[PDB]
Amino acid sequence: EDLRRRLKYFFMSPCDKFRAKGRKPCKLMLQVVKILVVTVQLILFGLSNQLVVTFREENTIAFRHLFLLGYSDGSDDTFAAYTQEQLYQAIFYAVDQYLILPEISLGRYAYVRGGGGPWANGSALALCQRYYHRGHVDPANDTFDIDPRVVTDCIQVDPPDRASYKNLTLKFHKLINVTIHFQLKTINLQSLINNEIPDCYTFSILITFDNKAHSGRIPIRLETKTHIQECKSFRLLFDVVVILTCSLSFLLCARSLLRGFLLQNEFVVFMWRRRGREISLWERLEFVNGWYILLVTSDVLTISGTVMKIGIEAKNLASYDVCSILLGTSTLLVWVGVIRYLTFFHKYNILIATLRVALPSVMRFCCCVAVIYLGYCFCGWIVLGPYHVKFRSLSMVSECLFSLINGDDMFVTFAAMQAQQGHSSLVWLFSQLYLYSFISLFIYMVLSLFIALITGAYDTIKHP
Amino acid sequence: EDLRRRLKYFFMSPCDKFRAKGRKPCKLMLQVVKILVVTVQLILFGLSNQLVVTFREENTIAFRHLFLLGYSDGSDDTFAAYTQEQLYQAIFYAVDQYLILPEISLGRYAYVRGGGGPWANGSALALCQRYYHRGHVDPANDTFDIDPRVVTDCIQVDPPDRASYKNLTLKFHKLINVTIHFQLKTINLQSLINNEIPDCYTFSILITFDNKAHSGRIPIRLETKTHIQECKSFRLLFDVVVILTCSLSFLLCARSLLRGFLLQNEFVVFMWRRRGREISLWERLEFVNGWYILLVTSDVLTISGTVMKIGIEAKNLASYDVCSILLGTSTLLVWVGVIRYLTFFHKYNILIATLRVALPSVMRFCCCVAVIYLGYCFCGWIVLGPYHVKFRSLSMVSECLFSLINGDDMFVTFAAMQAQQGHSSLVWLFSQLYLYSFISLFIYMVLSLFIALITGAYDTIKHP
Amino acid sequence: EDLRRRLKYFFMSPCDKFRAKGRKPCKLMLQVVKILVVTVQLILFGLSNQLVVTFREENTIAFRHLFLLGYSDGSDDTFAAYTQEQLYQAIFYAVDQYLILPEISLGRYAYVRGGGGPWANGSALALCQRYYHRGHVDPANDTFDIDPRVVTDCIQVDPPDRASYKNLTLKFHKLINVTIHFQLKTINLQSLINNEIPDCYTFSILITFDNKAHSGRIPIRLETKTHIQECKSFRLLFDVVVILTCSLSFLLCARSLLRGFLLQNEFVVFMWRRRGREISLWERLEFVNGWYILLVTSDVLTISGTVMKIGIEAKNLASYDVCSILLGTSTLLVWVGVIRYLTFFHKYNILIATLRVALPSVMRFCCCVAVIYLGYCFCGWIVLGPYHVKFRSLSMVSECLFSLINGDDMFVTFAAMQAQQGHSSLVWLFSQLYLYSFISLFIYMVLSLFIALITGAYDTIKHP
Amino acid sequence: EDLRRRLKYFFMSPCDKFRAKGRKPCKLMLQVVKILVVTVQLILFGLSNQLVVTFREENTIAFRHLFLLGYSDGSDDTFAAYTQEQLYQAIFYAVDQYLILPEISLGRYAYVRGGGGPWANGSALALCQRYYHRGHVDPANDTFDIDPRVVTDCIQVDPPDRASYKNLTLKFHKLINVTIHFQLKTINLQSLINNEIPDCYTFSILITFDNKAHSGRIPIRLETKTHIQECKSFRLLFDVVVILTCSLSFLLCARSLLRGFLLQNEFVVFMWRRRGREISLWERLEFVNGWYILLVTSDVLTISGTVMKIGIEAKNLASYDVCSILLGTSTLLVWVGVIRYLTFFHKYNILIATLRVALPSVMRFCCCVAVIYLGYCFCGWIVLGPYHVKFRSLSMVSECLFSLINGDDMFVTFAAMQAQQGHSSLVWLFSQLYLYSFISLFIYMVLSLFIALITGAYDTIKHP
Ligand SMILES: CCCCCCCC/C=C\CCCCCCCCCCCCCC(=O)N[C@@H](COP(=O)([O-])OCC[N+](C)(C)C)[C@H](O)/C=C/CCCCCCCCCCCCC
């Protein structure tokens, strides 16, 4: 029958199609070209992003050394002030170093007029302290008369062209935070020399003296925001080429999916009517090609990411996160799709089919063990949280347990529990039981069962 | 027979019971609701405890920076004095910083009159040194005339309202320890702003200069004890709801267990008399439902923990350890009990039954390997203890070996043995043999046998 | 026949022997008692050794802080002098701190007259510098006129009762090392208070300024040797009890081995003569009991270790290493021997026999993989040795590779190779190939084959 | 037939050949001797290289402490200057320490006249700064008038026999780097005393103040190049012996390969003509001996490495990398070739054949998983690169992922992602999904499938 022959044309391997009709498999070549071009585009994007990130990080480190009093490398998380004098000296040192920046900095930084932020009236530096509107606190008499309104008092500082901030008085009893805003603009000379494209950076520096905890310890932070700007192509052409290749692949895959859907409809209308027997939904799902779904998803992701990258490279978006995520996911998807080419040979198809037939039982076992994992996570978070640095937050607990079951950072956890004793022998004994039981169970039973499932699936595939 | 039909009603799946009698499985819904409510209660308790712990830790760090002379972060375990001058300066610095606390601290701390402890006569700070009653020690002449009575000499220090301690003279040759007791009370402003509940903390600060070792090195420690106190609801209602749900679940499960016991009694009295044949204890154990035992245990633990949490949240107990342990264990138990729902489908029941039938042989192999593990622990503790930081105590030895068999911190152990050489080539050679033999055996035979046991159990389950 | 019945009495389980003759298995009870007593003795010995080691280590740390100029904790391996002034100040600081020790030390240390060592003429401190007899070295003119004779010039320093060393002049161009010898004696007050046994320690302190490398960097070390001495029982009785129990067990096991040998001789003389057929050596080996060999070995080791421990506890040997090794090995052996009791039940015997029948093929595979492991060790040592801290010595290379195959410290090795680049791209590429190939092979083939061997042995045992 | 008998002589085991013809297997003894001699030569070479490397490293550390202002151990990667004053003080300190080296150094270092490098006119020290020809940069006005020509301005410094550099003025706005070149020569006294061979080292010291990044932070580096020179045997004889043994082994193996090729040619010309049937290429490959190929490769590598080592030991090449690589590869190859001896016994041949028959499917599975691994590498590099220190470069990403799949440095990666939050919740969520999916897949499916493949191959070998 015509339907039988047309269905036989479907599901044949590309080699069989070439034997039957002598049509060159140009779709396969197109997909290979797509893999190559998307990988090249991702590599170039990554190299440029690496350069930009390195420049930003080095400038931020230089700013930290320039403006933070007594700063040392590797102490960002513990850098804090503990006395009123320390806070005053830190703030004054930051402002003073700002005021004499041209004659001390190794980098060519230029002041930005009006860069003090929204709280500045055109001054380059803004020194703002925020405190509660009314903050009469009396721990001795147990008085908490508090007005939750926040009051922002700012001091405007301007650099000399070509000292009222010294009279700053803090409100420690009701202080919330102290912030310093200013902007510095410079030129990336490596970009000037190498790629001849003049990139002029603008760093927005924010120094925070955070007292939101009101715990007597005020951490000190320095953060930067960068605005790239051209200051008075092969990449764009390659991006256009990538977009065109992805669009062509998407069109071909969509047409193939439509043809498969039409063939499925013809088969079902023939079988339900001429033969009378009703067919199931699995017979419908057999007609779809999951590889084509993967390909169209990768094409859509690549097209969106390439549009975003074109916008970014023209200094218009500066939103690298979403574009990078899209491009990386698309590249991963195409490199996974290479498995379809690998599946056309039975020797590789044995292993691929072993994985495919093992997947359902593996997922079921994952569902079975997820509840035990979650119970252990909750118990560890609630009990060992106050006493263990690795159990402070639920995500941290999950990461610690996942590392434990894979044999990483075990003795560190045990020694952390041992050194402080947990401030209670009962807590220490519970931690011993908890860790030993969890590691023993998840390593010597769950992993072994995963291995057993995979081995059984391989045995079934090898001996049908 | 009536007994046969009633026993057939027992052991049927919930779906079969619904088919037979059309009774909605409301016990299952009750257990799901119980899981949800206990998880929510545990999450809320954990968040509040996290806030309290963070506040306490930050205040303790601030106190360490304020009162410990030359203190630096990350040096608590090595912070010590080595000369008489160092000890004198440390003590005097602590007291002096206490006396000028209001004008230097970033936190609003208030003095506590009469907070010097039992050894104070109403003074805020107590500076006590403890020494032996008679301590004439002559290492040159080998004289050890010692009276083991301890003498406590205290100095009372009071802060100014709105210097005799400078004449302190120590008895180094017979000194036991020097301690400083005082209390500071403050207000948690985050609690004031966010949850509007005024919490007034009271920190009991104890600085210890410990000379109990009499080894010429005196470690210096700072410890704090916190007493939370309200200073002049949804949580309680949710706790009551959790208690009621757990009580209802406990009642239903106990009634089901009683019905099962009655059915077992009827079956045994029918079989032993009418049929004459004596039945075994395993036939008795078959009639019990282990899931119901787990559920009633979790209910009891949750009820006790919720009562303790209600007491704690009213500022009456301040004993978080036991309540947290009970709540975490109950949450873990219910999340494990979810496996009973998972067992009603044969696809998941295959894996669950594989684990169940593998458990006995796994336990037997654990018994077999425990003696070898203990022998290795004892040998390592006795030999490598004097030369390895990881082998100082038996629990430390067990943790190190358990980490070793799971492939963690191996090269660190080897390098620790190598760097010092063990001060003997014989000890180094023994350590090489010990570590290599232990790791090789336990990784390449014991773990492989665990995998083999699990695989065999899975093979038996898959092919009955 | 009589021989058949007597041989049948041999090899029966203890339960079968009890059934046959009604003889209480008192040898088993004796061995259990032996296990208990040796474990208790080892635990007590370990606790006492822990106390002694802690005291010695704390005193050594105090000495390092007292006598080493600018010393900081955790910098022993890098503590060195780099200029002539630094060396002079270090030596002078050490001697000056020695001369004013009583008025600065927190520990009660007494001077030891005549403790300066062999190079002192009765003075308490000896300051000796060693240099070549003739050391005219001219790097500019390439002159190496050297007399390898070493000349020791000493300066005698005596503490005041109840400054010529300042004129010390070094010979840097030919200097070998500078050493400082003195002794301090003290009293362990914890021993005085707790166990009432007066222990008077004598520390031999040696400070070394080593210039044997002649590399312009002189490391500085402080080492101590301790001589314990009583200064003007249950333990001994328990040691005697342990010795008696071990001797009785040794006698019984030797008698049993002799009886087995006699039975083997009777069987062989009957079979070779009456039956004519010649029997093999495996039939001889079947008659021996390996558990009895283990027991007699453990008894001999325990007896030797207990004699040494008795000698040590009387302050006569001070050689803890050999005694500790003997005692630990004996304890490990008896805890392993518990497996014989475990073997009397078939459920545990299944696993034990699985291990026993897997052992030969496991050993053969170990022989197969040892040559590859050794080749990789040699290649890594010769190539990556100059560029990797983990490949400096052959034992270090072996430890690093053994940790690598067990999934420990992998990224650390990779990052160490990456950070310095190996000072050559060829070396970096070779390191990449070397590490990837080694880890891949040994993890994904060798370990899998070990698992396969164990699984096959278990399959053979389970299905005979 | 004659051909059948001659082919039967081929492929027989050495024991069978000895039985047939009584010829002593002297080739096997020659190969054993070769293994021994190459291992001994490699060990001696490694020991000498260890001594040289240790001397060079110690001298470099001494130079770093002598010439780098404020240098501390373990801070090479972060050592940098951040102000103009800091750079000036660092440069001046380096030059000043050079000028007074004889009276401060602990090592006997001699000045080298004319050692300032190509940029020196015979002076011992060269202080050169490099800057752009025209470097008018105006970040405020966005001006980048740049002439990419580099201008090198040098200052010549000469040590006193038996201060114009103080007037050095830098061009920070256009500075590229500042370098200091000088040479110091010394004598290795350990070589003088121990092996009596006078080795006179010449260190070329280069201090770099790198401003190529133009980021306001100037890293400071010290690098040394060493030229060994004899200054006014058993090793050579052993090298000659090794060369002769390798040449003899190569000749014998080549002759055996030629004989095998001739036998293959005779067999093919007989079978294709007399029998008519055409044979395949696998029948040709069966006649070759892979062990002989391994042996000749190892012989060639050893001969080349020994020639290079002979050249090096005469102070003529100083290129240790290539020689070490060749020697290590040859030693690894011969230690692998020991497996051929192991293959002559069927008990070991079982395991060896298991590995051999598992190799093809293992390679196919590696090809299958390589594409997924590469996709994950690309995605991680592009996304987590800006936010993770472990994902900066593609090789670093590959090393991190390879360590992750083997259960190493997992929690460190998770905590690195957690601590900074990735500066975006979307990036953090993506990192969670990425890491969890990658680790789960590669550990619980890929490794299990490798184990299953090995187990299946072992099952096929065990039960033919
Ligand atoms: C759970 C489902 C089935 C899983 C099956 C897999 C089991 C593992 C498989 C093979 C065995 C591999 C190794 C097992 C290691 C077990 C170690 C147990 C603890 C040994 C303690 C010795 C030190 C000592 O004896 N410790 C004692 C002496 O102390 P110390 O002298 O060292 O002083 C320390 C001081 N300090 C203040 C207390 C810190 C100490 O006082 C007791 C501690 C209690 C230990 C808790 C035991 C919890 C074990 C339960 C685990 C269940 C799972 C089974 C595991 C076999």
Ligand SMILES: CCCCCCCC/C=C\CCCCCCCCCCCCCC(=O)N[C@@H](COP(=O)([O-])OCC[N+](C)(C)C)[C@H](O)/C=C/CCCCCCCCCCCCC
């Ligand atoms: C035990 C039950 C059965 C278990 C079966 C599983 C076995 C493992 C499976 C597969 C093999 C995987 C790798 C095996 C690694 C074995 C390494 C052995 C030691 C190699 C030493 C090389 C360095 C050197 O040759 N080291 C020598 C040269 O020193 P150096 O030049 O490096 O200088 C160092 C200086 N220092 C002062 C000594 C520190 C050194 O002098 C000797 C050391 C003795 C080494 C002890 C050997 C103990 C091994 C017994 C283990 C038994 C279990 C079987 C293991 C196969």
Ligand SMILES: CCCCCCCC/C=C\CCCCCCCCCCCCCC(=O)N[C@@H](COP(=O)([O-])OCC[N+](C)(C)C)[C@H](O)/C=C/CCCCCCCCCCCCC
């Ligand atoms: C060997 C017997 C059989 C064993 C069978 C088991 C095999 C493993 C099983 C499953 C697969 C699991 C993961 C495999 C990971 C393989 C990674 C290969 C290297 C990838 C490099 C990407 C980074 C890059 O592409 N790196 C390139 C780009 O550099 P970059 O941009 O990162 O810059 C770095 C700068 N620097 C100065 C060079 C440091 C770099 O230039 C090339 C490096 C060469 C990499 C060496 C490859 C050696 C692999 C041989 C191993 C053989 C064994 C088989 C393994 C499959």
